Amino acid sequence: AKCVSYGVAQIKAPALHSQGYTGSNVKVAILDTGIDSSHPDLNVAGGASFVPSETNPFQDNSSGGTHIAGTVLAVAPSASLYAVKVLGADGKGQASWIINGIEWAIANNMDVINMSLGSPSGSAAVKAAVDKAVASGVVVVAAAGNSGTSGSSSTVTYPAKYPSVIAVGAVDSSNQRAPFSSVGPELDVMAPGVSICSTLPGGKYGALSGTSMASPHVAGAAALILSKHPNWTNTQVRSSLENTATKLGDSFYYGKGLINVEAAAQ
Amino acid sequence: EEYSAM
Ligand SMILES: [Cl-]
Ligand code: NA
């Protein structure tokens, strides 16, 4: 990646890069606002838009999808990216667009789905789609949500909140939970999500914060792990990430803790 | 549109 970010070292990705693992032959669908494929630093292998007012998945009028695409490649430089536009320029989307993106990812044999998006109430139809994706063997990763805390209540957003989906919270460069990072027993792992520098539309770069930035560190880590263990199932990849995480404190705030892709890749 | 970028 052309923009330096602490987050790649923080999850111990350089150790795997040094071993020769960069996520070769792994298909990662970015279900987001698009990917600006004109970025000199991003190669997008294919895609689809399901946003009827925004018909080009290879442009990004929001900036999130391009940023997230860059983070996946910063962690897994050889991953194959797919731009699946399910959110419009305002970063908002309908359940149906998301389902269409999940179904496209199944039909096109994606290895990993990243969904840096959430709703507070969720959708039974989205649940059926993500569960189908996971049953078909896709690693499904989502942002845990930016809804902070609510006493003893879970604030994890949908679809992260569903058991089939890996819910990723955000830490800063000091491994402290970001104040915005959602919490609850559904939180699975943490990754870097504060002031992450990555690709922006119009050939730009810049820092963004959110569980949206934490999720692609884990999507990229899944790509690294599959490159070292191409025969592993999604269940095995998920188990590896959860079972080898660095514990950071109470699981309500931190889940299993910070992903350690060096440890997870065995 | 209840889903938002995170
Ligand atoms: Cl949902
Ligand atoms: Na979940």
Author numbering:
A (entry chain S): 1 to 74, 84 to 275
B (entry chain B): 275 to 280
The publication says:
We describe the design, kinetic properties, and structures of engineered subtilisin proteases that degrade the active form of RAS by cleaving a conserved sequence in switch 2. The engineering process to develop specificity for the RAS sequence QEEYSAM involved extensive modification of the Bacillus protease, subtilisin BPN’16–24, a canonical serine protease in which the scissile peptide bond is attacked by a nucleophilic serine (S221). The nucleophilicity of S221 results from its interactions with the catalytic histidine (H64) and aspartic acid (D32) that together form a charge relay system. To generate high specificity for the RAS target sequence, the active site was modified to be dependent on a cofactor (imidazole or nitrite) and protease sub-sites were engineered to create a linkage between substrate and cofactor binding.
